Amino acid sequence: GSHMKFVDEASILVVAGDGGNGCVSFRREKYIPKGGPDGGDGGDGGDVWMEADENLNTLIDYRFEKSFRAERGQNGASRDCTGKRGKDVTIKVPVGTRVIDQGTGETMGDMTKHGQRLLVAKGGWHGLGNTRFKSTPRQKTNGTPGDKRELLLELMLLADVGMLGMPNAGKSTFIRAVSAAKPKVADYPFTTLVPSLGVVRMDNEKSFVVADIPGLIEGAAEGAGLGIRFLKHLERCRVLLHLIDIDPIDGTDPVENARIIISELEKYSQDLATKPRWLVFNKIDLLDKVEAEEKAKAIAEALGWEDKYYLISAASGLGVKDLCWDVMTFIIENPVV
C-alpha cells in the first residue's frame, strides 16, 4: 500500500569549545613565609546542544547556516583563580527532528517534545594548574579539545498550507515560485510523478510547508491510501489556498469551477472543508489591473464570498510575497493545539 514520505534533511557542523589551560604560579609574599603553589585550573569548554522548538516548522535555516562553534574555556590565573567556563550554543530544531552522527551513522536522538535538549558536542575539559601537582611543582596541563561532529538532521514533513484548485490554475507554478527547497521523497517505488510539496522560507525561524492537495488525494500512483494518510495529520494544516485562474481560456466560467472544487472538498472530508480557506485569483498579469479587480470582485460576489481575497501572478511574482507573509502571519498566530 501507500508509504510515500517527504523528508527534510540538513547537514551541519557542531564544534564545542576547548578547555582553558592550567596556570603555573606561586605566592611569593614578604612575611607570608612559604613558596606556595597558586596557579588556577582552566575553565571547561562550552557545549553544543540541540533543543526541540514546537514553533519551528522546517530545517530550512540549516541549509544556509551550517556551522556552529561554542566558546573556549578561559585560562587559569594567579591566586588559584579558576578560568571561566566557555559559553554554550543551543541550536533549535522542530519537534520530530531525528539527529544522526554522520561520522558513525548512528542515531543520537529524536527530538519528540518541546524544550527537550540533546547534547551533540561535549566541550573540552579544563587544564590543571600547578596547585594540583602539590608535594613547589612547575607543571600545568592544557585543556582538552572540544568535540567536532557532523550531524545529519532528518524531519518528516507534513503540510502547513494546502493548495486547492482546478487543473491548470497555477498550483505547481505557485509552489515552485515560493519554494526555497523541494523535500526528498522516501519509500516510494517510483521516482517520477511525485505530488508537489515545497518548503517556504520567509526569514530566520519563519518557514512553512506547502502541498498540492489534489496530488495527495488523487490516488495517482499510490492509490487511495495516500489521501487517508494526509487526513491523519490534518491538524498541522492551518490554512488552504483556493487558487483560481481569473480568466480561463479553456471558456470555463470561474464561478462554477470554484463551486465544483468546494463541492469535491466537502465530499472528501468535513474537517478539510472547515479549515480556514482563502481565495487567491491567479494570472492577473494577462489582464489590465483594474479589469482584474472587477473580474475578481464579481467572482467573489457571485460565490457569496465575504472575506478578503488575493490577486497574484504566480508567473511574474506580483502579489506573491504579500500573500506568503500573510500565510506566515496566520501560521505564527495559530500554533497547533
Ligand SMILES: Nc1nc2c(ncn2[C@@H]2O[C@H](COP(=O)(O)OP(=O)(O)O)[C@@H](O)[C@H]2O)c(=O)[nH]1
Ligand atoms: N500568464 C500566466 N501563466 C501562468 C500563471 N501561473 C501559471 N501559469 C501557466 O498556466 C499553466 C498551468 O500552471 P500549472 O502551475 O501547471 O497548473 P496546475 O495544474 O494548477 O499545477 C502553466 O503553463 C503556467 O506557466 C500566471 O500567473 N500567469
Ligand SMILES: [Mg+2]
Ligand atoms: Mg501541474
